[PDB]
Design a protein around this nucleic acid. Structure first.
Lengths: 56, 110, 46, 120
RNA sequence: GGUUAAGCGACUAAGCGUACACGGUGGAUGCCCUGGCAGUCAGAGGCGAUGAAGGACGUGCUAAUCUGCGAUAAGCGUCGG
RNA sequence: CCCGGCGAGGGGAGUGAAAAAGAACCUGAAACCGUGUACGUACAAGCAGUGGGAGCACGCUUAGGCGUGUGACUGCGUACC
RNA sequence: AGGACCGAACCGACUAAUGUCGAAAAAUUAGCGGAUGACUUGUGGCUGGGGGUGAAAGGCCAAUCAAACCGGGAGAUAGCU
RNA sequence: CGAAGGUGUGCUGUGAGGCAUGCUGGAGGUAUCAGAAGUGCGAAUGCUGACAUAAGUAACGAUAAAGCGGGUGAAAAGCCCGCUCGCCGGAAGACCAAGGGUUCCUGUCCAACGUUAAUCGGGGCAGGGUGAGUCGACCCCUAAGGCGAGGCCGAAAGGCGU
RNA sequence: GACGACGUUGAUAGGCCGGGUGUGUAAGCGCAGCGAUGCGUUGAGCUAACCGGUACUAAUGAACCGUGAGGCUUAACCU
């Protein structure tokens, strides 16, 4: 539970070698509405494969 | 022509804003707005509210061009601390320091 | 737990009050040192 | 170790779990759409689809059966009285799940459950 | 010029190291004074029942606190500058 | 004036000798923290330096080669009080 | 009638758990001992450091007690780090 | 037409150091030779201020419990309403004394506080509200008990007491 | 985190019809009983994850990283 001899800022870096946020670059474009949602999701205006699905 | 926008004293820590403002290093703006609109975090609330304020400083003060407009440098740097006192058990306290951070967004056409 | 300061103003007044501490000569020196050490609140007042 | 089990626990005791899925399924058919998280959306489906299954072949006894499982006759009033000819032909599924997005409250995978036949 | 094999063989860098350029936090150094200590020189060497030292509560154009003052309350009269 | 939540914060403009003097305000070191460029680095172990040293990268002279950065690999080497 | 029995309140702390950088500088869940007495609680007083008080443990005297705490002797003294 | 200080740089001395100079800096510095000391720091589990590390780990404070729709709004698991669900009920209900002293309420705001966000709050800004011949005290009467005119007693204070 | 099965050229999941399984004579009517209840309907009814099928819903066109015949020298075979 304790540290006896403080690790350098070197090894503090290499522990942070894998924290990097996964990119969500894979956007989609609508079939018959042309707008952009996230893939397998709905827009801000209720479109999903060219349908007013939620009408909100 | 070059322009810079800064949010000073953003109420978080440096590694919390370093992680999403690592992806938008070396990007164009419209792919950066689209990688920050759908990153599910709090720093993506922070700097995406400021990264759009940087392009405002282009279209208004510097180069109105936004289509082919790059982001050159972005580096979140530390700020002050709100050193409150946290109570730990058995009578002893604990000097908490609520962290605070500064972010620059630098926008130009290299 | 039953912590030590279970307070009052009736215990407090007749012990550490003005006329209590400015009764005897050994009390009076405290009122004549809190003066000279320049304290605002002399002993207890509301 | 879960190997070939089913019915996710959703981090509540069984008594709490069953009583929520009542008052979501009561809430589901009254407003016809709900926003929930992804698993509750994914597992309100496995609970509600019995109801409109056991309400096409209308009987006297199945009224209490959708009252022993519901204890809400106003929801039972919408069943058997509109839902009958609404679902004669759908041999099977009645829910088109929609993946909406992300809860700005606490980063949940939000979603949308509906009955299929929608015109309002 | 092409072909099989044999030997040898960089640029890759998730991060990390070092030097420079860049700030970031930080508030040390130099500089500054109506702050304070030690004394020289005279003067005083007391205030107090024709109500003290030290306080409470009020007073203005005012919300507050400090200074002053006290139902005549940031002030009255009086003789001067 | 633009952007923002008619927030915070910030970029221009104007004052001013200067806003890398802006109310957290003269000067602003070090620890610590990042940005960029250059080099080394994923078969090598060990007080992390020193002696030697290829290549690469640069300021240059004067084109013969020094200076600075890094430093593969190698010889020794078990911190201070 | 009972310093009588059973058992809540109230009280006390027996056993185990958990906790023991605690939710707490002595607790929480499961039980346990009593429960009209030599009991329990509230409020207002009295006693005082070689002194109080004690169904006596050197226990208690503001989480500290084989002599409390504050200031003053006093910058004690230290052949000792 | 640039003092100290800071920050690099080329030179220089056997070392402690010195001298010249680029940038930053914006008003003070001090030769030669001598005089006096709060005169040179790595340690003392030294003091003080600041910043690392463990670590983005642990934990979020009782294992009474949520779920949905609507609205306000820039953004809503937590705020306001409605609809059910679940928990307390010799209490986790409602009044009072103690003790706290605006903590109650409307408008408004989210920097900070609330172990999170927050339009909400016992948070900040502003205003408002507490109305008694009978309720409690003050007031008339004593207990335990404290002072204590004369007095007794004691180096002095002061102790006991009518 | 990996490995595996599918993504409308679809049985990968949920639903659904049936079967299987488990519990036992559902409810509601009528009869017998002043009544509790017993009988008939009725080995009915209800049935988690099990097995066999059915696309009813959910598993989209893309977008994306990954490229553009693969260095030096010698030998042995192509001419």
């Amino acid at each position: 539970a304790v540290q006896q001899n403080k690790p350098t800022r070197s090894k503090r870096g290499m522990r942070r070698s894998h924290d990097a946020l996964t990119a969500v670059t894979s956007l989609s474009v609508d079939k018959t509405s042309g707008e952009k949602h996230l893939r397998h999701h709905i827009t801000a205006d209720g479109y999903y494969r060219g349908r007013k699905v939620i009408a909100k | 022509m070059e322009t810079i926008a800064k949010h000073r004293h953003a109420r978080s820590s440096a590694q919390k804003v370093r992680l999403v403002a690592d992806l938008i290093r070396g990007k164009k703006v419209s792919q950066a707005l689209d990688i920050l609109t759908y990153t599910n975090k709090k720093a993506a609330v922070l700097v995406k509210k400021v990264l759009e304020s940087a392009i405002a400083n282009a279209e208004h003060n510097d180069g109105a061009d936004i289509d082919d407009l790059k982001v050159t440098k972005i580096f979140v740097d530390e700020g002050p601390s709100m050193k409150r006192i946290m109570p730990r058990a058995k009578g002893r306290a604990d000097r908490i320091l609520k962290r605070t951070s500064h972010i620059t967004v630098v926008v130009s056409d290299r | 737990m039953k912590r030590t300061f279970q307070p009052s103003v009736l215990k407090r007044n007749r012990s550490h009050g003005f006329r209590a501490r400015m009764a005897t000569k050994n009390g009076r020196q405290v009122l004549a040192r809190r003066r000279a050490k320049g304290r605002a609140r002399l002993t207890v007042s509301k | 170790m879960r190997h070939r089990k089913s019915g996710r626990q959703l981090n509540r005791n069984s008594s709490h779990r069953q009583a929520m899925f009542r008052n979501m399924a009561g809430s589901l058919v009254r407003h016809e759409i709900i926003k929930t998280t992804l698993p509750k959306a994914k597992e309100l489906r496995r609970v509600v689809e019995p109801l409109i299954t056991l309400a096409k072949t209308d009987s006297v006894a199945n009224r209490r059966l959708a009252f022993a499982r519901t204890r809400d006759n106003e929801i039972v009033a919408k069943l058997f009285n509109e839902l009958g000819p609404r679902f004669a032909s759908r041999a099977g599924g009645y829910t088109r799940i929609l993946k909406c997005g992300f809860r700005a409250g606490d980063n949940a995978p939000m979603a949308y459950i509906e009955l299929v036949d929608r015109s309002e």
